[PDB]
Structure formats: C-alpha cells, structure tokens
Design a protein around this ligand. Structure first.
Ligand SMILES: [Mg+2]
Length: 276
DNA sequence: CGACGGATCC
DNA sequence: GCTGATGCGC
DNA sequence: GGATCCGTCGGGCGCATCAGC
C-alpha cells in the first residue's frame, strides 16, 4: 500500500505557532546526493536546521554548492578517520549554536563521525547515524554495546534543557514500522536486540517518538527503501529515521513529517515543526 | 533485504 | 588525470 | 489447497583503491 503524508500542522496544542523547522536526511553519499539535486529540495523545504547522515565525505571534499546556503551558514561536519567513504554526519543551522561537540564520549580517540551535539538557547539537538548490525548480523554485538553507550551519554545531556534527537537510528521499532516484519526479524534493523535497545532509549532518557506520538496507528509510513527490486515504487520500506523529544518538549510539538517524494538517496527527508 | 522455492497448517 | 574493475559496507 | 512460514539467493547503490595508460 502506498502512503501520503498528511498536511503540515504548524501550530502547537497550546495554539502557539511553529517557530522552528528541523530537517533530517540520510543522504547516502553527500556528493552523489548533491548531483541528484538533493540541495534543490532542501532549498524548497527551507529548514532552520538541517541534519545529514552518511555524508561519506571529508570536509575538504564538500561541494562548493554548500558554500551557497546563506540561510544555513553555520555548518558542522564530522567524518571518521581512516574510513572516510563511510559514515559522516553534518549539521547546518540558520542561527549559531551555543556549543557544538562530536561523538558520544571518546571521539578524540574513537573518531567515528556518527554523532553531533549542538546546544541552542532552549534545547539540545543531537543528530546520529547509528551503526548498522550488518549483513548476517556480524556487527550486532557492537551495535548493542554502542546502543548502551549512547543511551547513557544521552541521559547525561538531558540533565539540563530538553533534548531533540534526530537522524537515522537504524531500527524499525515495531512491526508497524516496516512493510515485512516477519521476514526481517533476523535482519539488521529489526532484530529483537535492536528493537529492545530503541525501547530502552525511550524509557531510560526518557524520550518520545514524535511521529508515532502524533500518528500512533498509521501504517505504511517509511523513511527507507532498498535500492534493490524497485522497493520504493512498491512502498516496501522501513521507518529508520526519527525525531525523538524530551517529554517537556511535547507541548512544543506541532508536527513530524515524512517527505516521501524527495528523491536523491535510499532514505527520504523527515521534518520537525516545533513552537519554541 | 525482497523475491522466491519449498515445507507446514487445517 | 581519467576510466572502470574490484572491494566493501549499506 | 490457499495462506503462512522459513531459509536461501542475487544484488542496487556510493565511494575508496588499484591498474593501466
Ligand atoms: Mg545507508
């Protein structure tokens, strides 16, 4: 079954207007994505903050088109050392953040280029590219260890102002979050271990899944489709990309969108509207 | 990782 | 410098 | 004997490195 994201709701339950628009996108190769016109779509979307995953691009190789973004002029990039064509995340913002950091504790040593933390006036933003369990689950145990380290890192951050965590969390939380739950229960992204880690993330920090909070029973809503076997044209997909919010931000929540039609990667953008 | 072949269920 | 094969991970 | 289950198989994408010229 195909899916049509509902219209943008731009006012909070309190009646406050959205003042902040955040877009998150696993671009599956930033240089390729730009050649496939992904930046033209960002311009049409005009977010205040853009978070990117799988840039697969060290900062010296960023295309000049990224120098041409006057409304997203504060840019922060992270890539892993000695593994440049993998991972990589970016955060681009209209306003300058108060603080920026990289990693979840030991990036000066680990340097994975998967997490960026940016503190703004009223909230802390984290964008993440969560490590894949891999074909045949060969990296599932590392993913479980990373999950636990990430949870405890985030619990620390949420100690002060509210948290917004966005990005490719590389798990479909529940059966409604992918088209083939039963066939994928032993595949990366839908193992009981990864699903449980996502549940623990929500409970331990604590965080709410913005999209599911708003649309708790909506099926066929995905953010990823394999390039293989024309899966996207059939909407055989997974919901891997999320906006998770501290409970204290839920009165600020206007909408959480899935931009199904934006091409340029095997994930589509997701967009958050907050009334701060 | 979805398509597919083959086994199992009533 | 440039192409395309191969490797590897998603 | 249609629906469901389950294990196996081939493989699209992007980017690095390499050989060759
Ligand atoms: Mg990917």
């Amino acid at each position: 079954a195909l899916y049509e994201d509902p219209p943008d709701q731009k006012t909070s339950p309190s009646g406050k207007p959205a003042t902040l628009k955040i877009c998150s996108w696993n671009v599956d190769g930033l240089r390729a994505w730009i050649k496939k016109k992904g930046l033209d779509w960002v311009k049409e979307e005009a977010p205040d903050i853009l978070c990117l995953q799988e840039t697969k691009c060290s900062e010296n190789k960023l295309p000049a088109e990224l120098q041409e973004l006057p409304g997203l002029s504060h840019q922060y990039w992270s890539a892993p050392s000695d593994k440049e064509g993998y991972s990589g995340v970016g955060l681009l913002s209209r306003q300058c953040p108060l603080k920026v950091s990289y990693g979840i504790g030991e990036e000066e040593h680990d340097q994975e280029g998967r997490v960026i933390v940016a503190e703004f006036d009223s909230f802390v933003l984290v964008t993440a590219y969560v490590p894949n369990a891999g074909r045949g689950l060969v990296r599932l145990e590392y993913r479980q260890r990373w999950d636990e380290a990430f949870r405890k890192f985030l619990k620390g951050l949420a100690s002060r102002k509210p948290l917004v965590l966005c990005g490719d969390l590389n798990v479909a939380h529940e059966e409604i979050d992918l088209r083939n739950p039963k066939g994928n229960k032993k595949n990366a992204g839908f193992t009981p271990q990864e699903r449980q880690g996502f549940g623990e993330l929500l409970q331990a920090v604590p965080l709410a899944d913005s999209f599911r909070h708003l649309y708790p029973n909506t099926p066929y809503a995905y953010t990823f489709w394999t390039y293989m076997m024309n899966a996207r044209s059939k909407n055989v997909g997974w919901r891997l990309d999320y906006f998770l919010l501290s409970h204290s931000l839920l009165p600020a929540l206007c909408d959480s969108k899935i931009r199904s039609k934006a091409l340029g990667s095997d994930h589509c953008p997701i967009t958050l509207y907050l009334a701060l």
